[PDB]
Amino acid sequence: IYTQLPISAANVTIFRPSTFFIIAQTSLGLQLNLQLVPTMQLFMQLAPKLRGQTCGLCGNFNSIQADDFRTLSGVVEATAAAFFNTFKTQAACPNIR
Amino acid sequence: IYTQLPISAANVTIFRPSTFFIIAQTSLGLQLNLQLVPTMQLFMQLAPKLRGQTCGLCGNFNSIQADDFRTLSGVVEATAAAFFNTFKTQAACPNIR
Numbered sequence: 069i070y071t072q073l074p075i076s077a078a079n080v081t082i083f084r085p086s087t088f089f090i091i092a093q094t095s096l097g098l099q100l101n102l103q104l105v106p107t108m109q110l111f112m113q114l115a116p117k118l119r120g121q122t123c124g125l126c127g128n129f130n131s132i133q134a135d136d137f138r139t140l141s142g143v144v145e146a147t148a149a150a151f152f153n154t155f156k157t158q159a160a161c162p163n164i165r
Numbered sequence: 166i167y168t169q170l171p172i173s174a175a176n177v178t179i180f181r182p183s184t185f186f187i188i189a190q191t192s193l194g195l196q197l198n199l200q201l202v203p204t205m206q207l208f209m210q211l212a213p214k215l216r217g218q219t220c221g222l223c224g225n226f227n228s229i230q231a232d233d234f235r236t237l238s239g240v241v242e243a244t245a246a247a248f249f250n251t252f253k254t255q256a257a258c259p260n261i262r
């Protein structure tokens with residue numbers, strides 16, 4: 069549903085600090101800063117309580133850079149593209165090299 | 166949720182033909198024209214399939230004006246105010262004389 073900021077939804081509040089940014093704060097310790105001018109950029113912030121618990125393109129948040137390229141299969145890839153291609157959501161998406 | 170027109174929701178479509186009117190059409194044979202400029206006025210149109218079945222401030226749609234002041238109790242009131250006050254939704258609302 070195309071809504072209108074600001075919103076106080078279930079556990080999440082989204083608002084516009086200015087005409088350039090959109091900020092979405094959750095009660096789980098996750099904040100999103102979204103720059104829309106000139107191009108979209110994302111700054112995600114995670115609370116310290118989620119250290120070693122998350123996983124995805126942003127790593128597992130355990131202060132170790134080496135294992136940030138570890139896929140869901142349990143091995144650490146050697147290149148950024150190989151680890152990147154394992155987090156697609158659709159089959160038709162190309163394999164980036 | 167504060168939405169933006171047009172909306173195609175379940176069994177209803179709401180749009181803005183102009184800056185003065187909002188039109189909401191349902192699949193049950195009901196249509197609402199809402200004039201917003203200069204003051205809010207309503208025109209409801211009902212399909213013939215609902216003749217003799219509805220009931221409210223707009224009558225029972227049975228081509229008889231005599232029973233249009235019939236309340237849910239079962240009798241026809243004599244004044245517009247007495248029948249009008251029986252279709253309140255809250256107890257604290259005043260009784261119009």
Ligand SMILES: [Ca+2]
Binds near residue numbers: 127128130133135
């Ligand atoms: Ca890590």
Ligand SMILES: [Ca+2]
Binds near residue numbers: 224225229230232233
């Ligand atoms: Ca009638």
